[PDB]
Amino acid sequence: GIEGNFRLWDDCSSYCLVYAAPHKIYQTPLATKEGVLHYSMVMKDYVGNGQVLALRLDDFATVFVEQESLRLSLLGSDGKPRNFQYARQGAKHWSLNWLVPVGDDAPTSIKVFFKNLDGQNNILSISPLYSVEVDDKTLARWPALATFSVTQENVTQGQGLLGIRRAGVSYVAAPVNHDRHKRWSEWHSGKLLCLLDPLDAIYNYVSQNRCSLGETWEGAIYQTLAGRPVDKYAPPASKPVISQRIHFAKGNALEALTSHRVCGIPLESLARRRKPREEWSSCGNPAANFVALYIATRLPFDQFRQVIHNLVHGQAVAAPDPVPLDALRTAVIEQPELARQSIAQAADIFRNYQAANPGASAAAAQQADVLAVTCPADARPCGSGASSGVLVQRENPTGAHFLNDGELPSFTVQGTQNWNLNRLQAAHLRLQVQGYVFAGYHGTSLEGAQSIVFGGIHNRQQDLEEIWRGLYVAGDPALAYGYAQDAEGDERGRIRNGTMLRVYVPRSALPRLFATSLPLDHPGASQEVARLIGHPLPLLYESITGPEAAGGNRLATILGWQLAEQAVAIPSMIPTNSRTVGNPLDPATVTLEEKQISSLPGYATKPAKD
Ligand SMILES: [Ca+2]
């Protein structure tokens, strides 16, 4: 047993029992290019007399062990204290983990998570990966100078005990080359677990979408450095919610998450770099800037579609102070579509925040944490019972995850770049193998495409009857092509060419892809479509395919947003053209090769069983 200082790797590699005393801090060393360290140990504590144990993680955190909760208490470079609580729910065992990045240009946040366990080392649940931004002094301190320590905060009768098993630290190397933007792109997502042999089982179990997708260092070697850490954990009984809780010191959470959605930038990439290295000139900074500027005018976020339009066309606006409004006007006129994309996303994020936090100000939203929930990519709604004080980011897959290692596509007025007919077929294979089917063509603006393909298909406000809300697609490219452009003209009235996208939905949704012969503008559409799906509109986890409004010689598919948010989109090879904007689709331009992969799903014409 340990009644003083110790050596964790030596003493607790298999088992050691700490006789926690108040008034005594039992300390240990933690000594052992680019990569991740995963410190791990399995705990069984005894705090039966209401003892509270305090485990100092070097200089950056403190874990408090109470009988019914594991509490983490953080200290970044901000100085201010941030506290969290994880419920044990009667569990007597638990794992303590934390992930430290090492490198010259590695991330500047450490992660800390607990797992509740049964007697037999089976996962019962997992905590959020609590992320904590730390200074360069703190980052330099690993792996060689860092220490761990155990103590009891309170004086009680009885004897506080902490039995540690299977203490260890494992390294995993960053991949060779890999553009830094991409290399660490999963540091702030659930997929971080995929870098970790013990836990790679869990993420794959939850999503099913596999760790195959993303920069998850497939070829990496999860290697031990010291002690004897647990090597593998079994998939739990029920599916756990994998989630990362991320903080923003600058109080720019809405700006950041908006950038993330609009531009498809890793939340990690929008955080302190060790080596500053503006390469976010094209999308990142503008989008964030729009949110800041919009906030400064105090305009309701729901009115934004109107507002942006007015500022584009020199129509008045209800702002008392003209200076912030003008700052916005200027930025809006320079990039009216990107302004429209940016504040659309921000609007959705903020609407959700208020649903979890009634009467909360944008200013408050800006200082909230982001809770990146990797959804159980199957059932229905992941984000559930928000911890109040978080912006909930639901992580489903994105088109970009299915693209080759080649130079990533981009959406110019000349057209889609680095996108040939080979990459589409190869990317179509992956989507098939991964259990998706083509649902239809989608036409969007250039900036709309970067949003959808890289940031993912996220719900946006729309000037649509609340009932008919959803992502619109179409079997016939002609119908989608109508919308492959800026939604409206700038101050000169110019409408740029856009981009043609291919939306794919998951195969497992096929029973829920309904079809009617009745026009969607027909009065009795709402009732008939409701009869087909089992509830009144709007559309949840189901699609609807029917005749477009008017005579309309084509079929329009509306994906419900819940389905849409699980849907994925890649670039079509059907080009738009800068000279012909406003014309119909010239069918010469649609290749046969792409036509052959665009067979449509077998729609259902009868309500599901009851
Ligand atoms: Ca692995």
Author numbering: 0 to 31, 40 to 284, 287 to 619
Show the paper's wording.
Despite having disparate levels of sequence homology, all PLTs had nearly superimposable structures compared to PE with pairwise analysis showing root-mean-square deviation (RMSD) values ranging between 2.3 Å and 3.2 Å (all atoms). Primary sequence alignment of PLT proteins indicates that K57 is conserved in Spx but not in the others. However, superposition of the crystal structures shows the presence of a comparatively positioned and positively charged lysine or arginine residue on the same β-strand (β4) in Cfx, Hmx, and Jlx. Chx266hGH, Abx259hGH, and Sfx257hGH, were the most efficient in transporting hGH across SMI-100 monolayers, while PE259hGH, Chx266hGH, Abx259hGH, Cfx259hGH, and Sfx264hGH were superior to the other PLTs for transporting hGH across AIR-100 monolayers. In comparable conditions, Hmx and Jlx appeared to be more readily cleaved by human furin, with Ahx and Spx the slowest, and PE, Chx, Cfx, and Sfx being intermediate at pH 5.5. We superposed the newly identified PLTs with PE and observed extremely high conservation and positioning of residues within the catalytic cleft, indicating that the NAD+ cofactor can be accommodated within this pocket. Remarkably, loops 1 and 2 of all PLTs superpose well with PE, whilst loop 3, which is conserved at the amino acid sequence level, presented more flexibility in our substrate-free structures and may regulate access of the catalytic site to diphthamide. Although we were not able to produce active toxins due to safety concerns, our structural analysis shows that elements involved in NAD+ binding and ADP transferase are conserved in all PLT family members, supporting their putative ADP-ribosylation activity. Only PLT genes in Aeromonas hydrophila, Chromobacterium haemolyticum, Collimonas fungivorans, and Shewanella putrefaciens matched the core gene GC content. The GC contents of three toxin genes (PE, Chx, and Cfx) showed ascending trends, while others showed descending trends, not aligning with phylogeny trees for this toxin family.
Pseudomonas aeruginosa can also secrete a mART toxin, known as exotoxin A (PE), but with an organization of its three functional domains (receptor, translocation, and enzymatic elements) that is opposite to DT. All these PLTs were composed of a single-chain amino acids that folded into three distinct structures: a receptor binding domain I, a translocation domain II, and a catalytic toxin domain III. Cytotoxicity associated with this family of toxins is due to their enzymatic activity and the ADP-ribosylation of eEF2. Our analysis of four of these new members by X-ray crystallography presents the defining three-domain structure typical of this family, despite substantial variability in the amino acid sequences of these proteins.
